[PDB]
């Protein structure tokens, strides 16, 4: 009963000791069938025990693409027409969309507070190192004498190994943009939706640890209650003191921007053996386009930084965080000197043009302006756009000042010698402006807009005539046709 | 009320120690009492033999003639089965009860006459009484349900890890399908080497190991849930684990004063005896019978702990409305538990 | 066992669908509220379905030609989160009833074939969005057009991604309901239909008519027929499931 601990009513104890008995008999089909048969039926919320989470965290990391025989020698009938790893994942993502609602209008608050206890007990076992204790007493559980599940050891028992919660992050990030099926599948249905759960839970334990830690405490010590925070040990796994040049290259591992890291790339190895091997009796069917590959791998690289500008946002203006030893300004010019360095501009758009615009606020209109300020240092300044993101008149006046400052028109007479890089550079500084414009249009719900309109008309026409004088067979990367249709 | 298939009355005639015995039992936990050597085993032997047992199916009587007391000429056994609730097959033919008659003479065949409500013979074939017994889901054949004084003593005694597994498997009829379908090492292997579609037999046999593994998961899980729910009358916790690699029944328990569950064979006599009695109770759970007997559960458990065993038996068995227990024990023990509650029919 | 009606039979036009994706992915930071010229390679919904990898004249399953029994036919398919994204562009909510019903039935047929169903995303957000566009009375009366009585294999599939429909179709098929379920249990019991009975139990357990708990006489009926010990492998499953649906409260 240290904190968030909820005791067991006898009507939940039965389902607690029954699921563990079923799981002890190597019978996971019925363990899963226990939860699914009573999911959307009534207002009961049959919660998973906290040790039947570390089982679904290990039933998830064994997909048929490399363990087809073992998934068949367990239940050779396959009643549900699904595997053990595609239903475990479908439960963890179904009992998580319930946790982050806390809707008491249908469930009972006791079940919703018990489920949170199970989830936090589960995610309080993942303690990353660098290189069993059941809190209840009513029942004896599994995971006391059982170590491995179908060969795969465990998740809590493996991520705690020295230098392993850092290798699996680089595993799911580097093999994100891969072409070989044995490698791309190891991070599309095994480690990509599993890190999206770990990050979404480590970022919900933080939402609780802040309130129910010490109200009315000194600011100098409130920052000391963020060094033992759950989001602090998570980012403590990064075993370097160069977050200005290490967190900017761990998020973008397999991306190809202008990689200047003279140090050798991080050694990436599989978590469980046989992961980078497809099996003979399974042939893939889903065709993943290279654009689709680099759309769901940049919605995770951004989601992994979006949990770093939520830990750093809580640092008070006076002091700085102790355990990670990082600054909320050394990682806005670090995720901007590489974002402004991308070669494939279809990855740049996939990163900035996000499908979750409202939740992923508070840090995107910081890298967007932070990146536009990194490009104009070569195109030829002080950017105050985010401070003017609330009042449109000031943001306008600034953008007309910028376009009059000749930072959106092309460079000097050098046209064809270095066109291939100049066009990419000048168009990469247009997405940031477009992203900021979209945010303003969403954060604000007159004549200055029209003045920006005609100014951008003259600028675009200047680029157009410059490209015409470039004896070039195609159009320049115009701006206008986007802003015109955005405004209306 | 209780579904049909419970014994109303039992009448004997010139048995091992009873000249003319008449008992009446209820549709639930039914204690009967006495003392050592009072014919308590005689009634259990008669109730086993009166349905499906053979002359040498008890290992105590050598034939069907030694049962008759010396000096007597013959013997007679007659039982009554209730037919009022679910299970009253063709009740219009007989009535609301079924009467059987097992008469054994000094010389000649033993008649197996079946009677109706008014006591007139309606059948004499062994097959008729056998299908009557096996319809009401009676486990006559089974050598566990109607455990003898020594048969039950074989379970509730000094056991090891890979001995309770054997007892549980044999009692649960799970050492019958792992032998009737384990000779496949010669019927699918050595019965095909004559040319190096007759493999249809191997096709059915592969769709039959599913039947065993899906009836050993749901039958060894029901006997494990009713072992954690019977360790909660001493404020204990724990479970029992089947190891097919070793064929073992390691049972792990955790007491109020304990911090980490240990193996059963590390405690005093009382907790081990309680755990083994709990396992004995759990064995009967998966197999849906209708009549269960027992004799002499005081083999090694002291009276102070035999009282706790009695309370366990009373809570676990009295509430069930579909298992007529006929437990036999000499001492009168209706003075500690809730025997006054409806569902107990202690008889002397 | 290995054959689940496989709506998408041929291969997918991976080159034309890839082109359509690139144009569409730049149409989320320009619209999202106002309603298209991103796609005119598929002027009608039938053309889009053909692009997905379906054959001509495709919306019904009849089982005369073993329709829900076609084998693997290992054809590659496009990701479901994009197939459903391209599909909703053809709603025309304020339009003719026939095209709306065609869209509904095409959506349904695309939902419950093994190719899509086995490779769906656990996020599971698009399908519910397509569901709220219709009321469950019109999603179950003009429902998935599989037969009602004998076909309980895709009923369990439907009530496996849309669980809140559990009591929505049970009052349509069983149109007194408590005595109708046992009546339709004997018909699948005195027919030796031990495979379409397993999915009859898994479908209707949990509703208002057949609740969980120790209380149904089914476990009796699945106890007299077990004497062969080699009878059937879908009869030692039906009794292990029913032994678990009783110890649940």
UniProtKB/Swiss-Prot annotation, chain A:
Please give the GO cellular component terms listed in this UniProt entry. chromosome, telomeric region; nucleus; Smc5-Smc6 complex
Q: Which GO terms describe its biological process?
A: chromatin looping; DNA repair; double-strand break repair via homologous recombination; regulation of telomere maintenance
- Could you list the residue ranges that cross the membrane? none
**Subcellular location per the Swiss-Prot or TrEMBL entry:** Nucleus; Chromosome
Q: Name one GO molecular function term.
A: ATPase inhibitor activity
Listed A to Z, the keywords are: Chromosome, DNA damage, DNA recombination, DNA repair, Nucleus
Self-association and partners: Component of the Smc5-Smc6 complex which consists of KRE29, MMS21, NSE1, NSE3, NSE4, NSE5, SMC5 and SMC6. Interacts with KRE29.
Q: State the protein's purpose.
A: Acts in a DNA repair pathway for removal of UV-induced DNA damage that is distinct from classical nucleotide excision repair and in repair of ionizing radiation damage. Functions in homologous recombination repair of DNA double strand breaks and in recovery of stalled replication forks.
Give the note.
Present with 907 molecules/cell in log phase SD medium.
**By what name is this protein known?**
Non-structural maintenance of chromosome element 5
UniProtKB/Swiss-Prot annotation, chain B:
Could you tell me which InterPro entries the record lists for this protein? P-loop_NTPase, Rad50/SbcC_AAA
Looking up Pfam families in the UniProt record yields: AAA_23
Location of the protein in the cell: Nucleus; Chromosome
Q: According to the lineage, what is the superkingdom?
A: Eukaryota
What SUPFAM superfamilies does UniProt report for this protein, alphabetically?
P-loop containing nucleoside triphosphate hydrolases (SSF52540)
- What positions does the entry give for ATP binding? 34-41
Q: Give the family this protein belongs to, as stated in its UniProt record.
A: Belongs to the SMC family. SMC6 subfamily.
- Say what the protein does: Acts in a DNA repair pathway for removal of UV-induced DNA damage that is distinct from classical nucleotide excision repair and in repair of ionizing radiation damage. Functions in homologous recombination repair of DNA double strand breaks and in recovery of stalled replication forks. Probably plays a role in structure.
Q: Cite the domain annotation text.
A: The flexible hinge domain, which separates the large intramolecular coiled coil regions, allows the heterotypic interaction with the corresponding domain of SMC5, forming a V-shaped heterodimer.
Q: What else is known?
A: Present with 339 molecules/cell in log phase SD medium.
Subunit info? Component of the Smc5-Smc6 complex which consists of KRE29, MMS21, NSE1, NSE3, NSE4, NSE5, SMC5 and SMC6.
Extract the PANTHER family matched here.
STRUCTURAL MAINTENANCE OF CHROMOSOMES 5,6 SMC5, SMC6, STRUCTURAL MAINTENANCE OF CHROMOSOMES PROTEIN 6
Kindly provide the name given to this protein in its UniProt entry: Structural maintenance of chromosomes protein 6
Swiss-Prot record, chain C:
* KW DNA damage (keyword) present: yes
The residues the entry assigns to the signal sequence are none
List GO terms (cellular component aspect): chromosome, telomeric region; cytoplasm; nucleus; Smc5-Smc6 complex
Gene Ontology MF, one: ATPase inhibitor activity
Task: List where in the cell it is found.
Answer: Nucleus; Cytoplasm
Q: Name one GO biological process term.
A: double-strand break repair via homologous recombination
Transmembrane annotation, as ranges: none
Q: What does this protein do?
A: Acts in a DNA repair pathway for removal of UV-induced DNA damage that is distinct from classical nucleotide excision repair and in repair of ionizing radiation damage. Functions in homologous recombination repair of DNA double strand breaks and in recovery of stalled replication forks.
User: Could you give the subunit structure recorded for this chain?
Assistant: Component of the Smc5-Smc6 complex which consists of KRE29, MMS21, NSE1, NSE3, NSE4, NSE5, SMC5 and SMC6. Interacts with NSE5.
This protein's name: DNA repair protein KRE29
Q: Which residues of the full protein are shown?
A: 196 to 464 of 464
């Amino acid at each position: 009963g240290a904190h968030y601990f909820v005791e067991l009513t006898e009507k939940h104890l039965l389902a607690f000791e029954m699921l563990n008995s079923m799981c002890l008999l190597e019978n996971y089909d019925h363990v899963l069938l226990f939860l699914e048969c009573q999911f959307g039926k009534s207002h009961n919320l049959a919660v998973i025990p906290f040790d039947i989470i570390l089982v679904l965290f290990t039933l998830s990391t064994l997909s048929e693409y490399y363990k087809e025989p073992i998934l068949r020698a367990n239940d050779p009938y396959n009643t549900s027409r699904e595997t053990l790893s595609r239903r475990a994942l479908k439960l963890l993502q179904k009992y998580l969309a319930i946790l982050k609602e806390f809707d008491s209008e249908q469930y009972n608050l006791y079940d919703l507070e018990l489920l949170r206890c199970q989830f936090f007990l589960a995610i309080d076992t993942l303690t990353p190192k660098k290189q069993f204790k059941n809190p209840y007493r009513s029942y004896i559980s599994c995971l006391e004498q059982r170590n491995t599940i179908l060969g795969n050891r465990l998740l809590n028992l493996k991520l705690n190994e020295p230098g392993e919660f850092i290798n699996m992050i680089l595993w799911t990030l580097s093999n994100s943009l891969q072409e070989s099926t044995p490698l791309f599948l190891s991070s599309h249905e095994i480690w990509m939706p599993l890190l999206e759960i770990l990050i979404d839970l480590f970022s919900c334990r933080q939402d609780y640890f802040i309130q129910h830690e010490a109200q009315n405490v000194s600011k100098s010590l409130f920052v000391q209650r963020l060094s033992e925070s759950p989001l602090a040990v998570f980012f403590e796994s990064l075993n370097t003191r160069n977050f200005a040049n290490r967190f900017s290259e761990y998020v973008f591992l397999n991306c190809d921007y202008k990689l200047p890291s003279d140090n050798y790339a991080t050694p990436v190895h599989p978590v469980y053996n046989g992961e980078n091997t497809i099996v003979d009796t399974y042939i893939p069917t889903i065709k993943c386009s290279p654009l689709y590959k680099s759309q769901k791998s940049l919605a995770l690289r951004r989601k992994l930084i979006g949990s770093c500008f939520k830990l750093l946002l809580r640092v008070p203006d006076g002091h700085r965080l102790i355990t990670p030893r990082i600054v909320a300004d050394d990682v806005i010019q670090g995720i901007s000197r590489t974002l402004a360095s991308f070669n494939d501009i279809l990855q740049f758009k996939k990163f900035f043009m996000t499908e979750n615009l409202s939740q992923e606020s508070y840090f995107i209109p910081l890298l967007a302006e932070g990146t536009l300020s990194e490009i104009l240092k070569d195109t030829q300044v002080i950017l105050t756009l985010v401070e003017n993101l609330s009042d449109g008149v000031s943001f306008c006046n600034e953008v007309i000042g910028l376009v009059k400052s000749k930072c959106f028109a092309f460079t000097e007479q050098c046209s064809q010698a270095s066109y291939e890089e100049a066009v990419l550079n000048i168009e990469k500084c247009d997405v940031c402006l477009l992203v900021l414009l979209r945010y303003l249009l969403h954060l604000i719900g007159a004549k200055e807009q029209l003045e920006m309109l005609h100014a951008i008309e003259k600028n675009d026409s200047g680029r157009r005539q410059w490209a015409k004088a470039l004896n070039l067979g195609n159009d320049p990367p115009l701006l206008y046709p986007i802003v015109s249709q955005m405004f209306g | 009320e209780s579904p049909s298939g419970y014994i109303k009355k039992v009448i004997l005639r010139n048995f091992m120690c009873h000249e003319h015995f008449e008992l009446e039992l209820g549709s639930r936990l039914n204690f009967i009492v006495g003392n050592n050597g009072s014919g308590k085993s005689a009634i259990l032997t008669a109730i086993t033999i009166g349905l499906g047992a053979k002359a040498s199916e008890t290992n105590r009587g050598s034939s069907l003639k030694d049962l008759i007391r010396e000096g007597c000429y013959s013997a007679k056994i007659i039982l009554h089965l209730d037919n009022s609730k679910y299970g009253a097959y063709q009740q219009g033919i007989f009535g609301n009860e079924i009467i059987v008659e097992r008469i054994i003479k000094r010389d000649g065949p033993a008649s197996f006459s079946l009677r109706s409500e008014n006591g007139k013979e309606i059948s004499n074939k062994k097959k008729d009484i056998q299908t009557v017994v096996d319809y009401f889901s009676v486990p006559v054949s089974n050598p566990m349900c109607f455990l003898s004084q020594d048969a039950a003593r074989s379970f509730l005694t000094a056991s090891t890890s890979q001995d309770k597994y054997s007892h549980f498997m044999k009692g649960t009829l799970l050492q019958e399908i792992t032998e009737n379908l384990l000779y496949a090492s010669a019927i699918h292997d050595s019965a095909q080497e004559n040319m190096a579609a007759l493999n249809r037999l191997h096709n059915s046999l592969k769709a039959r190991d599913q039947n065993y593994k899906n009836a050993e998961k749901g039958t060894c899980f029901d006997a494990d849930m009713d072992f954690r729910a019977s360790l909660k009358v001493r404020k204990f916790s724990g479970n029992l684990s089947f190891i097919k690699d070793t064929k073992s029944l390691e049972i792990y328990i955790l007491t109020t004063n304990d911090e980490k569950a240990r193996n059963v064979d590390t405690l005093s006599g009382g907790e081990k005896s309680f755990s083994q009695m709990a396992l004995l109770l759990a064995t009967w759970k998966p197999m849906r019978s209708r009549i269960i007997a027992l004799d002499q559960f005081d083999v090694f458990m002291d009276q102070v702990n035999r009282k706790i065993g009695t309370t366990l038996i009373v809570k676990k068995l009295k509430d069930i409305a579909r298992t007529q227990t006929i437990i036999i024990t000499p001492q009168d023990i209706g003075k500690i538990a809730d025997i006054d509650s409806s569902g107990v029919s202690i008889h002397r | 066992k290995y054959k689940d009606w496989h709506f998408i039979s041929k291969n997918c036009h991976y080159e034309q669908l890839m082109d359509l994706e690139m144009k569409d992915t730049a149409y989320s930071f320009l619209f999202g509220s106002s309603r298209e010229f991103v796609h005119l390679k598929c002027p009608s919904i039938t053309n889009l379905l053909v692009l997905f990898g379906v054959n001509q004249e495709k919306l019904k399953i009849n089982y005369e030609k073993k329709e829900n029994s076609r084998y693997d036919n290992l054809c590659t398919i496009f990701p479901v989160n994009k197939m459903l994204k391209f599909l909703m562009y053809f709603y025309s909510d304020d339009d003719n009833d026939d095209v709306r019903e065609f869209f509904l039935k095409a959506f349904i047929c695309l939902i419950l074939d093994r190719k899509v169903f086995n490779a769906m995303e656990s996020d599971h957000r698009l399908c519910f969005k397509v569901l709220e566009l219709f009321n469950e009375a019109h999603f179950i009366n003009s429902y998935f057009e599989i037969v009602d009585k004998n076909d309980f294999f895709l009923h369990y599939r439907l009530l496996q991604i849309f669980p809140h429909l559990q009591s929505a179709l049970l009052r349509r098929r069983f149109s007194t309901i408590q005595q109708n379920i046992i009546k339709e249990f004997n018909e699948f019991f005195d027919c030796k239909n031990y495979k379409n009975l397993l999915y009859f139990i898994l479908t209707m357990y949990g509703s208002k008519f057949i609740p969980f708990g120790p209380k149904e006489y089914f476990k009796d009926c699945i106890l007299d027929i077990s004497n062969e010990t080699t009878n059937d492998v879908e009869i030692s499953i039906l009794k292990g499931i029913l032994n678990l649906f009783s110890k649940i409260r």
